[PDB]
Scaffold this active site. Structure first.
Site, PDB file in Angstrom:
ATOM      1  N   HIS A   1       0.835  -1.202   0.000  1.00  0.00           N
ATOM      2  CA  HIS A   1       0.000   0.000   0.000  1.00  0.00           C
ATOM      3  C   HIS A   1       0.873   1.257   0.000  1.00  0.00           C
ATOM      4  O   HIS A   1       0.726   2.123  -0.862  1.00  0.00           O
ATOM      5  CB  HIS A   1      -0.934  -0.011   1.213  1.00  0.00           C
ATOM      6  CG  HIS A   1      -1.983   1.059   1.187  1.00  0.00           C
ATOM      7  ND1 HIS A   1      -1.752   2.342   1.634  1.00  0.00           N
ATOM      8  CD2 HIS A   1      -3.276   1.030   0.783  1.00  0.00           C
ATOM      9  CE1 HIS A   1      -2.853   3.059   1.499  1.00  0.00           C
ATOM     10  NE2 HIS A   1      -3.792   2.287   0.984  1.00  0.00           N
ATOM     11  N   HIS A   2       1.775   1.351   0.975  1.00  0.00           N
ATOM     12  CA  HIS A   2       2.781   2.410   0.998  1.00  0.00           C
ATOM     13  C   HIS A   2       4.096   1.948   1.621  1.00  0.00           C
ATOM     14  O   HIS A   2       4.145   0.936   2.325  1.00  0.00           O
ATOM     15  CB  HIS A   2       2.251   3.694   1.666  1.00  0.00           C
ATOM     16  CG  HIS A   2       2.284   3.677   3.166  1.00  0.00           C
ATOM     17  ND1 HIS A   2       1.172   3.400   3.932  1.00  0.00           N
ATOM     18  CD2 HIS A   2       3.287   3.942   4.038  1.00  0.00           C
ATOM     19  CE1 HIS A   2       1.491   3.479   5.212  1.00  0.00           C
ATOM     20  NE2 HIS A   2       2.770   3.802   5.303  1.00  0.00           N
TER      21      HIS A   2
ATOM     22  N   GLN B   1       9.671   1.220   6.497  1.00  0.00           N
ATOM     23  CA  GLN B   1       8.335   0.834   6.902  1.00  0.00           C
ATOM     24  C   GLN B   1       7.532   0.419   5.674  1.00  0.00           C
ATOM     25  O   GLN B   1       7.378   1.201   4.733  1.00  0.00           O
ATOM     26  CB  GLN B   1       7.650   1.995   7.619  1.00  0.00           C
ATOM     27  CG  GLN B   1       6.331   1.627   8.262  1.00  0.00           C
ATOM     28  CD  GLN B   1       5.687   2.805   8.952  1.00  0.00           C
ATOM     29  OE1 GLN B   1       5.136   3.693   8.303  1.00  0.00           O
ATOM     30  NE2 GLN B   1       5.751   2.821  10.279  1.00  0.00           N
TER      31      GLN B   1
ATOM     32  N   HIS C   1       0.056  14.131   7.027  1.00  0.00           N
ATOM     33  CA  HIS C   1      -0.279  12.910   7.737  1.00  0.00           C
ATOM     34  C   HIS C   1      -1.262  13.173   8.853  1.00  0.00           C
ATOM     35  O   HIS C   1      -1.053  14.029   9.712  1.00  0.00           O
ATOM     36  CB  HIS C   1       0.958  12.176   8.270  1.00  0.00           C
ATOM     37  CG  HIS C   1       0.624  10.975   9.107  1.00  0.00           C
ATOM     38  ND1 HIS C   1       0.025   9.846   8.587  1.00  0.00           N
ATOM     39  CD2 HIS C   1       0.789  10.736  10.431  1.00  0.00           C
ATOM     40  CE1 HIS C   1      -0.156   8.961   9.552  1.00  0.00           C
ATOM     41  NE2 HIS C   1       0.296   9.478  10.682  1.00  0.00           N
TER      42      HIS C   1
ATOM     43  N   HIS D   1      -4.695  10.682  10.873  1.00  0.00           N
ATOM     44  CA  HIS D   1      -5.386   9.390  10.902  1.00  0.00           C
ATOM     45  C   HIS D   1      -6.815   9.545  10.333  1.00  0.00           C
ATOM     46  O   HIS D   1      -7.032  10.407   9.475  1.00  0.00           O
ATOM     47  CB  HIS D   1      -5.311   8.734  12.293  1.00  0.00           C
ATOM     48  CG  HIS D   1      -3.907   8.524  12.788  1.00  0.00           C
ATOM     49  ND1 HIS D   1      -3.613   8.232  14.101  1.00  0.00           N
ATOM     50  CD2 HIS D   1      -2.716   8.589  12.145  1.00  0.00           C
ATOM     51  CE1 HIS D   1      -2.305   8.111  14.245  1.00  0.00           C
ATOM     52  NE2 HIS D   1      -1.735   8.325  13.073  1.00  0.00           N
TER      53      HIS D   1
ATOM     54  N   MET E   1      -3.078  12.497  14.573  1.00  0.00           N
ATOM     55  CA  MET E   1      -1.852  13.222  14.338  1.00  0.00           C
ATOM     56  C   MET E   1      -2.158  14.367  13.393  1.00  0.00           C
ATOM     57  O   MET E   1      -3.042  14.269  12.548  1.00  0.00           O
ATOM     58  CB  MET E   1      -0.768  12.304  13.759  1.00  0.00           C
ATOM     59  CG  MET E   1       0.014  11.520  14.819  1.00  0.00           C
ATOM     60  SD  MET E   1       1.196  10.353  14.120  1.00  0.00           S
ATOM     61  CE  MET E   1       1.973   9.679  15.597  1.00  0.00           C
TER      62      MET E   1
HETATM   63  O1  LIG Z   1       0.062   6.945  11.777  1.00  0.00           O
HETATM   64  N1  LIG Z   1       0.146   6.018  12.895  1.00  0.00           N
HETATM   65  O2  LIG Z   1       0.992   6.593  13.925  1.00  0.00           O
HETATM   66 CU   LIG Z   2      -0.491   2.603   3.159  1.00  0.00          CU
HETATM   67 CU   LIG Z   3       0.161   8.705  12.521  1.00  0.00          CU
END
Ligand SMILES: O=N[O-]
Ligand SMILES: [Cu+2]
Ligand SMILES: [Cu+2]
Ligand SMILES: O=N[O-]
Ligand SMILES: O=N[O-]
Ligand code: NI
Length: 308
Positions: free
Chosen positions: A63-64, A126, A196, A198, A268
């Site tokens: 996905h990423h 990640q 970024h 959520h 966030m």
């Molecule tokens: O974006 N999850 O910390």
């Molecule tokens: Cu993703």
């Molecule tokens: Cu986050």
């Protein structure tokens, strides 16, 4: 995309350059939306520059991807779930790969400085797996990083703007998280940005404010792929300028209050502003976790409050 095996992760490119392949150690995720992490120590102790990134991802399952530089990866060993963290120290984002938003290249002559006395000693990769529907096979998705020891005329960096104190009450229609700092370094030039949030974020916007005038750096729906998007016009930020950011959140759908934190149930408000600076003036990272001019947000452009 195939696992390297006998030749390993370091490929010589030229006298002074090499490629470093940062791949998953043949992993087989068991659930959907799995987040895997792993680290590579830099092979060189001395200072080096990251001048390119090549994604090596399985197009079906990934996905990423995110790549960070740091000195203390959250875990030792082979690999871990990024639920346990990415880095214990500050994770310096270098690269984002989104499936539905292909990455933009670094401008030529621009590199991140790593290694040496003060640079990142580790890479942390990640990988976010989406479907995991393949077969039970091993996956070695990751990134090929181009490193050189030839100093670059322009040094890439990250200006990170993040909320720390935001509280979103349950059901509250609109909650603004505002972030602002005075810029007090040499001129930086913004060429890319990433937002970024959520699940509660609807729009994220960042601006340079110079004598009361709001110049747009980036504005994005954080529910869209969270890649680095190029800036429409290269925006310089100079001593005395104010960097200002707003995330817009909803509390609707939630039974309890939502605050800033690391889990999915938390929120966030992050805005990653990727810049270059002249090498002799350069610094590699800056952060704003404050709101130094809160009443300045009275004249924030209307676009910052409506979704895209
Ligand atoms: O974006 N999850 O910390
Ligand atoms: Cu993703
Ligand atoms: Cu986050
Ligand atoms: O308007 N801030 O310089
Ligand atoms: O950065 N002045 O064009
Ligand atoms: Ni300029």
């Amino acid at each position: 995309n195939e696992c390297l095996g006998t030749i390993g992760p370091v490929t010589p490119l030229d006298a002074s350059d090499f490629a470093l392949d940062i791949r998953m150690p043949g992993v087989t995720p068991k659930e959907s939306d799995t987040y895997f992490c792993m680290s590579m120590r830099l092979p060189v102790d001395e200072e080096a520059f990251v001048i390119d990134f090549k994604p090596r991802a399985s197009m079906d399952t990934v996905h990423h991807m995110l790549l960070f530089g740091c000195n203390m990866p959250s875990s030792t060993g082979s690999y871990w779930f990024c639920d346990e963290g990415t880095c214990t120290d500050k994770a310096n984002i270098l690269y984002a790969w989104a499936r539905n938003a292909p990455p933009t290249r670094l401008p030529k002559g621009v590199g991140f400085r790593v290694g040496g006395e003060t640079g990142s000693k580790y890479f942390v990769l990640q990988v976010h797996y989406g479907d995991i529907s393949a077969f039970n096979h091993k996956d070695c998705s990751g990134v090929s990083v181009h490193l050189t020891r030839v100093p670059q005329p322009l040094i890439a960096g990250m200006y990170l703007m993040m909320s720390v104190d935001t509280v979103i009450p349950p059901g509250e229609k609109v909650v603004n998280a505002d972030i602002s700092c005075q810029y007090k370094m040499y001129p930086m030039h913004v060429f890319a940005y990433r937002v970024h949030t959520h699940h509660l974020g609807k729009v994220v916007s960042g601006y340079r404010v110079r004598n009361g005038q709001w110049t747009l750096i980036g504005r994005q729906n954080p529910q869209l792929p969270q890649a680095f998007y190029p800036v429409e016009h290269p925006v310089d930020v100079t001593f005395g300028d104010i960097l200002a950011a707003r995330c817009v959140f909803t509390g609707e759908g939630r039974t309890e209050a939502t605050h800033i934190g690391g889990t999915s149930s938390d929120e966030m408000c992050n805005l990653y502003i990727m810049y270059y600076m002249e090498a002799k003036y350069a610094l590699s990272f800056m952060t704003c976790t404050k709101n130094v001019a809160p009443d300045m947000f009275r004249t924030i452009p209307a676009e910052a409050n409506i979704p895209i």
